[PDB]
Each structure stands twice: as structure tokens, then as C-alpha cells.
From a paper:
In higher eukaryotes, a single DOT1 histone H3 lysine 79 (H3K79) methyltransferase processively produces H3K79me2/me3 through histone H2B mono-ubiquitin interaction, while the kinetoplastid Trypanosoma brucei di-methyltransferase DOT1A and tri-methyltransferase DOT1B efficiently methylate the homologous H3K76 without H2B mono-ubiquitination. In kinetoplastids, three DOT1-like methyltransferases have been identified, two of which (T. brucei DOT1A and DOT1B) have demonstrated methyltransferase activity toward H3K76 (corresponding to H3K79 in human and yeast) in vivo and in vitro. Both DOT1A and DOT1B represent minimal enzymes with less than 300 residues, comprised of a significantly diverged N-terminal domain (magenta in Fig. 1a, b) and a conserved C-terminal methyltransferase core domain (dark blue) that contains canonical and non-canonical methyltransferase motifs. Based on structural and biochemical analyses of DOT1A, we identify key residues in the methyltransferase motifs VI and X for efficient ubiquitin-independent H3K76 methylation in kinetoplastids. Substitution of a basic to an acidic residue within motif VI (Gx6K) is essential to stabilize the DOT1A enzyme-substrate complex, while substitution of the motif X sequence VYGE by CAKS renders a rigid active-site loop flexible, implying a distinct mechanism of substrate recognition.
To investigate the implications of these differences on the structural level, we determined the X-ray crystal structure of DOT1A and compared it to human and yeast active-form DOT1-nucleosome complexes. Δ42-DOT1A crystallized in complex with the methyl donor product AdoHcy in two different crystal forms (space groups C2221 and P212121), and their structures were determined at 2.1 and 1.9 Å resolution, respectively. All three molecules are highly similar with a root-mean-square deviation (rmsd) of ~0.3 Å comparing 234 pairs of Cα atoms. The methyltransferase motifs I, II, and III are highly conserved among DOT1 enzymes including DOT1A and DOT1B, and electron density of AdoHcy in the crystal structures of DOT1A are clearly observed in all three molecules. Specifically, AdoHcy is recognized by DOT1A Asp134 (motif I), the Gly136 main chain (motif I), Glu158 (motif II), Met196 (motif III), and Phe222 (adjacent to motif IV). In DOT1A molecules I and II of the two crystal forms, the CAKS sequence-containing loop FH lacks electron density and is disordered, implying flexibility. In DOT1A molecule III, this loop is ordered (colored in purple), which is likely due to stabilization by a symmetry-related molecule in the crystal.
Numbering used by the authors: 45 to 295
Amino acid sequence: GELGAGTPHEPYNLPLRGNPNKSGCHHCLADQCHCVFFERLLDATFRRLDIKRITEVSGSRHLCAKSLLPTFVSRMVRLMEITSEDTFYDLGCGNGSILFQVAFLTGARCVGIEISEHNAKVAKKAWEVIRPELEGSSGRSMSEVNIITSDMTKILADERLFESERGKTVILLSNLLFPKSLTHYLSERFRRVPSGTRILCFDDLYPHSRSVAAIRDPEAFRLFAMTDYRWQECSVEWCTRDGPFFIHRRR
Ligand SMILES: Nc1ncnc2c1ncn2[C@@H]1O[C@H](CSCC[C@H](N)C(=O)O)[C@@H](O)[C@H]1O
Ligand SMILES: [Ca+2]
Ligand SMILES: [Zn+2]
């Protein structure tokens, strides 16, 4: 039900419904969803936790931990075709909210990497509270959620990472406020992940809006199928309006 073409000229976009679906959601294509349930459960979890997310750090803009909201995640699970056989990596996982929802909706193994020691601790403690609640509410056992406290560059420096997954790999990179050197580093490293891997980014790893891009970087076009999207209105914490993001699929 997505509008547009997925090109720079006509990115894929999904207007909000005027009226809610059966589950109260204005965002999802499906008539039923879990977005409000996750909205409410996450808020109760973080409210009960004694340790709180550090959303911003004055002086270190790259540490900003504002969230992709549950409505964004429900759409992302569909757009990136996340299955139970996939492994989902949130590079910069913040409070872990994305991991918790992807695990619940897909059954995929979920790995978060976070440089903030405090927010990594928030994420780990929140998973211990929310997992039983998800499991009791749904009657299903949850997949594994592992939180790594590290600069992601130290983890990704291992060329063997991702390789055993045979492309059953989904990577989220919420890098709007990452330093350009980090996004550039990631763009080099992701050229070498296996075929089938799907990568979502906001500051584009492989800029492709200009006609000359395929002449400037033909390798990028040989290695990736590129699709442009607009995030839905009111689907990201830091902005009520829409904006661009990109999914790169390794050919
Ligand atoms: N080099 C690095 N290694 C690991 N995490 C990093 C990092 N540089 C920035 N980050 C983290 O990346 C996060 C981006 S905010 C994204 C939060 C979550 N993934 C969501 O989308 O809702 C921040 O928490 C910040 O601390
Ligand atoms: Ca490789
Ligand atoms: Zn929904």
C-alpha cells in the first residue's frame, strides 16, 4: 500500500490513515498491529526503571539517543523483510527499544551495540523487565537480545562478523548525528558483508541522488540495490514531520 517508486525523485511513502485501524494505529497498512501496545509497555518499563536514558549530552551531539518510535519499527519490519532466521543488529541501540520490538514481532536474534555505558546499562536492565512481560502477554518465548557496550568500530573491524549468517542479516544505522568519518567507515565496511544483507540508514552510506553517482562509484551500484523512503509523520521522536531514509540491500 506504499505510494511512490523508491527512487530519489519519488521515494516510497505511506500517508497516515485519517482514522485508526482496529488497534488504534494511524500508521500501519495492516488492520491490526502492536504499535500502541508497545508505546504503552515501553513507557511503563522505562518509568519503573530507576536508571533513566540520557537522551542528549550537551557537547557530544553524536550521543543523541532519541528514538525511532514503534510505528517506525512496525513498518521497518515489513520493509526489511525481517524473519525469525534473520539476525537484527541495531548499531547505536540507545535504550534498546528497537531490539525489544523486533524480537517480539519477528523472533529474530537481536544484537545491540552502544558506545554509551550508561544507556547500554539502561537497555540491559529494561530487557530483563520487559521480556517476561512480553512472554506472559503473548504466551511465546522471546528470541535472544544481546547488548554490547562498545564503539561499534571495534566490533565491525572483524571481517568475520556477519559472515556465518549468509545474508540473513538486518542492520539498523540511526546515524543522522553520527560523525561523517563514522558513516564513511561504515560505508566501506558494509561493501564486504554477505549478499542478502539489508541496511537501513538516514545519512546515506552510498549517496545516489545525483545522475553522476553511478559514474563516481560504480562499485556501490554493483554491490547494492538502493531504495529511498520517507519516514511516516510522527514516527520518530525528534520530529513530528516526515524525512528521508534509505535501505540498501546487498546484491
Ligand atoms: N561509535 C559508536 N558506537 C556505538 N554507538 C554509537 C556510536 N556513536 C554513536 N552511538 C550511539 O548511537 C545511538 C543513536 S540514537 C539511536 C537509538 C536507537 N537505535 C533508535 O533508533 O531508536 C546513540 O545512543 C549513540 O550513543
Ligand atoms: Ca566479507
Ligand atoms: Zn501500527
